[PDB]
Amino acid sequence: MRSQIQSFLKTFEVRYPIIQAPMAGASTLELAATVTRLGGIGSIPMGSLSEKCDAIETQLENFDELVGDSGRIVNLNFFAHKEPRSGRADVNEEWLKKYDKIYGKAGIEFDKKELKLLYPSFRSIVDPQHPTVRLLKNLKPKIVSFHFGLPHEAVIESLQASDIKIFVTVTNLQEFQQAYESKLDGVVLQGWEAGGHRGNFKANDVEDGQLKTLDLVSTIVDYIDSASISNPPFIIAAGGIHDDESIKELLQFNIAAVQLGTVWLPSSQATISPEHLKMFQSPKSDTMMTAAISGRNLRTISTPFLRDLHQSSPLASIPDYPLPYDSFKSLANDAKQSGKGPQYSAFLAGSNYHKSWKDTRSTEEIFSILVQDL
Ligand SMILES: Cc1cc2nc3c(=O)[nH]c(=O)nc-3n(C[C@H](O)[C@H](O)[C@H](O)COP(=O)(O)O)c2cc1C
Numbered sequence: 588m589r590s591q592i593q594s595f596l597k598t599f600e601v602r603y604p605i606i607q608a609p610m611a612g613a614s615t616l617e618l619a620a621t622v623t624r625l626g627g628i629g630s631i632p633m634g635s636l637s638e639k640c641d642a643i644e645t646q647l648e649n650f651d652e653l654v655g656d657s658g659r660i661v662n663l664n665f666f667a668h669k670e671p672r673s674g675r676a677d678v679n680e681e682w683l684k685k686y687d688k689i690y691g692k693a694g695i696e697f698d699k700k701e702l703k704l705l706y707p708s709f710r711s712i713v714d715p716q717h718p719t720v721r722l723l724k725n726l727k728p729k730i731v732s733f734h735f736g737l738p739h740e741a742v743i744e745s746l747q748a749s750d751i752k753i754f755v756t757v758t759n760l761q762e763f764q765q766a767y768e769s770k771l772d773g774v775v776l777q778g779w780e781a782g783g784h785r786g787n788f789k790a791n792d793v794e795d796g797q798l799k800t801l802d803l804v805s806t807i808v809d810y811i812d813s814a815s816i817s818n819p820p821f822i823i824a825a826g827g828i829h830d831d832e833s834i835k836e837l838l839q840f841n842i843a844a845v846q847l848g849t850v851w852l853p854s855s856q857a858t859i860s861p862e863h864l865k866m867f868q869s870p871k872s873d874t875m876m877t878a879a880i881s882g883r884n885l886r887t888i889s890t891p892f893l894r895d896l897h898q899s900s901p902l903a904s905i906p907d908y909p910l911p912y913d914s915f916k917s918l919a920n921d922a923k924q925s926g927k928g929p930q931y932s933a934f935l936a937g938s939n940y941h942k943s944w945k946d947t948r949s950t951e952e953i954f955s956i957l958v959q960d961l
Pocket residue numbers: 608609610611613632634664733734756777780781782783784825826827828846847848849850935936937938939
């Protein structure tokens with residue numbers, strides 16, 4: 588296929604084919620505004636905000652104040668997973684007992700009586716008249732992206748009628764075809780290497796092919812060429828992309844742009860713990876993919892506690908996402924407070940985090956290093 592770079596730059600009014608990945612709990616408004624100012628596209632993780640439309644608007648307005656204008660060259664990102672299933676009282680209760688014991692072994696008092704739901708899914712917005720949909724249509728960000736699946740097509744179509752470009756993470760060719768059939772404007776091809784949660788549509792799918800970002804891009808682009816598909820969405824690659832070499836290799840597939848998460852995590856505009864940062868500076872451990880933290884497969888740097896949590900948790904025993912994240916977050920908090928701290932924390936990062944420290948904490952320097960040849 589022909590290179591999509593120029594079309595992407597013109598459509599989004601940007602200089603460089605670079606998207607800073609939305610990262611719940613790690614990216615900030617400041618990081619996003621800075622990357623948009625530098626000439627890429629900043630992103631705001633709003634996955635928890637589907638029924639909090641005031642927060643959507645406030646955050647966007649604070650971003651506009653940081654950028655200096657209301658151009659809204661931004662990606663607003665939401666979660667569209669399946670909601671946790673009813674009928675799971677047995678599994679859920681056993682998971683609480685599990686955590687009771689974890690607290691006991693940590694020597695932390697345990698109070699928790701139920702796994703609470705941290706946030707709903709955008710998939711539960713079935714009505715195009717819902718206030719969140721009306722709001723996004725009014726706000727007109729350049730992009731609204733979805734992770735974990737798609738909301739109903741009536742909702743997609745309504746957002747598109749306001750000029751917003753809609754993106755979805757895909758992890759395999761069948762997911763790409765789903766996105767094509769639903770007339771998405773963009774797909775983010777997420778490799779197995781990617782840090783944070785994997786955006787496969789079936790949670791923890793046992794048959795996931797685990798394609799590396801290069802392999803996924805090659806598969807998708809070959810399908811487009813071979814089958815003669817004439818109007819493909821923008822193709823964005825994400826997962827393990829850490830330097831100008833990595834970028835160029837993927838751009839040679841004639842895709843639109845790259846989306847990078849982990850490389851920003853050392854910036855002083857990101858919010859990671861001193862222990863997480865130390866891991867970038869002196870990498871000792873590999874990463875691993877686990878569903879035992881949140882209920883859905885995510886990639887983190889490996890630690891003794893996270894390996895324990897992972898191996899102790901047969902898939903059939905893990906409550907649906909995001910129910911285990913409530914137990915995990917409450918532990919990490921309770922640990923932090925009662926003065927144990929980060930042995931119990933997560934360290935989200937992709938499998939090239941060990942090549943991602945560039946001896947700077949400056950977003951601008953990191954950005955310059957990435958875009959040198961563009
Ligand atoms: C700390 C962290 C948090 C993340 N949170 C989200 C999120 O809130 N929404 C989302 O769509 N993707 C999220 N992701 C995934 C990124 O969109 C992207 O797929 C990933 O960063 C790409 O791989 P890389 O980290 O190796 O660059 C997150 C990734 C990381 C590392």
